[PDB]
Amino acid sequence: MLLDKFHVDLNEDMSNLSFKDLDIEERKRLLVWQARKNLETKLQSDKDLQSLLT
């Protein structure tokens, strides 16, 4: 699981960060965090996505 692998906490907040300001390791953490947050939002409106989890 990506959050476990890259040590991104479930409840972490990285809303203020830009990739340009971060080193490579922190860029990976930001990419994972943004992906998770973007899916959370999508999942709350997309029934087809919800269906995949049941």
Binding site: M1, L2, L3, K5, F6, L10, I24, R27, K28, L31, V32, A35, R36, N38, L39, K42, L43, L49, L52, L53
Partner: protein, 163 residues
């Protein structure tokens, strides 16, 4: 091979890293996994837009041979992802990663670069080539049952992000 070859590879890989960071291609984060071994890189790539991979990010290991750039690196998605041009075990099978099935080009050569490899992988994710596919199950699903292909890819993305 030779001590000289190893020296040249490390020098070249430093330049490759500098170029990649300088160019900063969107959706790609890659660099040496540890500070004392430039021959093994950890990569994280954002799935390309308007593909089943769009909402995902994908981890891969990029391993360079001791005689780089006379041999291509091996790139392995970890965990493996479903895609016509990725072996079931995660190993990426595209022209740029092979030395001179099924001809044409462009195959690996020392004038290629890591950035070019990573850009090719992104293009691959957007445009699968089933005619030279390494995962026939993925090939058939892509051709015949795109809805199911996409459902499997998207479920795997959801699971990878903790849903």
């Amino acid at each position: 091979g030779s001590a000289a070859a190893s020296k040249t590879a490390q020098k070249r890989l430093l330049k490759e890293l500098q170029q990649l960071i300088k160019d900063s291609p969107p959706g790609i984060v890659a660099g040496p996994k540890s500070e004392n071994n430039i021959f093994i890189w950890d990569c994280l790539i954002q799935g390309p837009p308007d593909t089943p991979y769009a909402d995902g990010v994908f981890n891969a290991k990029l391993e360079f041979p001791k005689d780089y750039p006379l041999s291509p690196p091996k790139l392995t998605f970890t965990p493996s992802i479903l895609h016509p041009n990725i072996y079931p075990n995660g190993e990426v099978c595209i022209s740029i990663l092979h030395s001179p099935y099924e001809l044409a080009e462009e195959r690996w050569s020392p004038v290629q670069s890591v950035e070019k490899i990573l850009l090719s992988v992104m293009s691959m994710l957007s445009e699968p080539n089933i005619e030279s596919g390494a995962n026939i199950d993925a090939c058939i699903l892509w051709r015949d049952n795109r809805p199911e292909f996409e459902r499997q890819v998207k479920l795997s993305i959801l699971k990878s992000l903790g849903f």
